DNA sequence: CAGGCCAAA
DNA sequence: TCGAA
DNA sequence: CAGGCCAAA
DNA sequence: CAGGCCAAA
DNA sequence: TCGAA
């Protein structure tokens, strides 16, 4: 028995693109002093310890893709990130021969030079470090003495600029021409810093067990050894990353009157969870289902998220547990290992009177060499005869939104709870 | 690349204990007899049929370490029951060569001696029977007439006191000698108790169904065979058994605003839910998540369970489901066996006049040395520089509260729902 | 001299406090190991006029 | 043929 | 990895 | 290429 | 000894 | 098959 027509299925084209870039990055050696930080708001007072390891924003999509790439990976819906890679390689760490104090300097030949390396301080419970940018002294520039006022967004966008530079009719186009055209380097500004409660003001009861013992966590190699040696290479598959909301369905509701009936799920839990939890133990944890959620394409679509490109710069790539799709389907929360790199600062050669530590220390800069890809894939249906590509119902995404309209997103640079990343609202641009 | 150095991580210390114990049991062989248990309140009218076989108290802490042990264990925290185990040997069964009725009492040398083993009784949906003490009658000790006002509390602290005596300013101290010091034996009083519905009073449809064939789910031996062997070997590695608290964490309130954010949980159930169901069919069962419960160490601890002490003897040893951890974590409900040994009655051999079952019957009494063994772990942290120990965050635990404040625990002493153990509220003592 | 006879030296201050609870604690034995990484002399010493950096 | 049912394995 | 295989 | 989606396996 | 905890594997 | 083995 001949067959004329066999069962073919649908004619799905799938695309699939990857990029490539290599920054050159610039890290000072800060030394490690603890630092006053006054409450404000929800905030208490706690005692800040800086660390000179420099992060590295290998979580967001402008760290990958230039702003064409991006505009151009906006004209393809269904742009799932499936996976990234990232090596990480040093150079030469330069440091100074003798500060601008001259009395008191001692100039050396010899030096001492240690390389930090840390890679899960952001996914540890207890430390609650989190990432900051200090204001650094005049007499002692690798001395740090407070916090800048940028936040994450902001330091996130300067290097973005840094990066790409201005557009061709910005008046400040002449000041940062684009690292990806030039090669040169980048000087990064944002760097580790570890917390601990400020018993001072705290009346009661008091938790007087200092900072923990972060150093135990960390590796340190002798910087003179590791001239143009491979530090870092990590990769992550992402197991969910909508770039583009998926392709619009074309609806029931315009062709049958069931598109509103029910159907058994079972035991198996189809729609995703809220799980809110109170470190303070005032509270128990709460998992609420239902959360209010809305789609992201078709006629009710809500794009407030793409449209503002919050997953750029303002928002990591890696979103699972935020996104839902109707399909059954199996949700987990995921996250991304925080890579910081940077050198140990050198103590200068001038003596102390008492038992403790450095009190000057010499300039240095350690030398990054990093190279990063980004592998996508993208999927158009066919479905239908006519009017251009819809997907199948199955395929239909909601995100997660606020009572307010603002959609909820993840942030890595809140410190963690219970080893956990945290859902906030974006906030309009 | 040389590596000053290295991720060693937290000093975690692990300690191991072991507890063993050597019991003599004398249990009497009780008659087979229908005893009427009165309605009071919710309990409804039944017939209740005695067994001879008494229950061995193997899930209890009691069982397995003596006060002194039990007061050193309570400066542990972190003290996790990890497996329990129990061997049951039996001795020579003694029967009586002739009861206080000589009349008619027929003295023999020959005699038939058979031992009753029951290990999955309370496990079983519908056989529903229970652990009870009965009052023998004068005439014919073997024969229960009824059941003694003694609750399984003070049953078991009765048989605790037996066991390791009073304290050395107590008035009675005099009265009961440590058994753990004198090796001597101690008469088990507790025996199981099959039951079935009192239809006599039941207004309009009626289930006659009578008693359920327990006898097919019992083993049975020839205790002249048995002499000097092992009988019952039972090992239960505990799914959760928390003995005292886990260390209080850091709170993260003190240190970072954070500390109330929310994360999404997926699909996964990350919080323990409970379930209420309903034997009569006039509702369906019914499945809460987000149960009243509140943290057992930390700045708003509820320590009334451990204070009070209620796994020594009151509650058992297994608690699962009771105890959830803020860790993403799987949880089940555990139960445990419940074993029964003991000797059937030897029936007279005076004559009977009508065919029925035996009308009197000869004293006997079982010997059974027990050995029992008990390994727990504990764990210290370490996880800052000072302040003494303090633990993860993801090591907080909670317990089910009622809205009384009284905590909920598993008890085994009621029958089982739908082959189920139940919650219960705790009794202060 | 290095201190290697001290137990703050070993442990710290959390240690110490929770060894404080378990009686009939005996420090068994103790170990040490000095390593030396590049030694630093100064080019030249903050006089100047008779100084000769070498 | 005992541990969240047994007539399921 | 709330038995454990 | 049929059974809780298929463009997943 | 980085990805939803580590003192679990 | 919201990593992936």
Redesign the interface.
Known sequence: ATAILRPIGLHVEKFQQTYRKKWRFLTSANANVILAEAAS????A?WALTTGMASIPWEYLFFYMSPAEYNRMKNYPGTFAKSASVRIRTWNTRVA?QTGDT??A???????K?L?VAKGIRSI??I?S?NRKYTYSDTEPMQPTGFATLTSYEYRDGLKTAMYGYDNDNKDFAKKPPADATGAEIYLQDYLTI???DARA?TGTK???????Y????????AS??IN?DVVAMDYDFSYAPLVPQFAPVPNNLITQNYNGSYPAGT???????????????T????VRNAPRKYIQGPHADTTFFDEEQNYLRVPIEQ???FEEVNV?????TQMPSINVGIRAVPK?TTIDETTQANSWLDAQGYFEVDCVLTTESVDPYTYIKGGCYSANTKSQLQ?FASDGRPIAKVYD???????????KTVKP
Chains 1, 2 share one sequence.
């Open positions: 708001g929800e905030r208490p706690r021969f009395q008191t001692n100039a050396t030949l010899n030096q001492n240690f930090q419970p207890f609650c989190t917390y601990t409660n705290t938790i007087l067990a200092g900072f923990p013992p150093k135990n966590f960390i590796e340190e190699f002798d050894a590791c040696t198996k839990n189809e729609v995703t969870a809220a799980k809110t939890t109170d470190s303070s133990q005032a128990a944890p709460t998992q699972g547990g935020i389907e199996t949700v987990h929360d050669l997660y809140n410190p963690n709870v219970y080893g956990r990343m945290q859902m906030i």
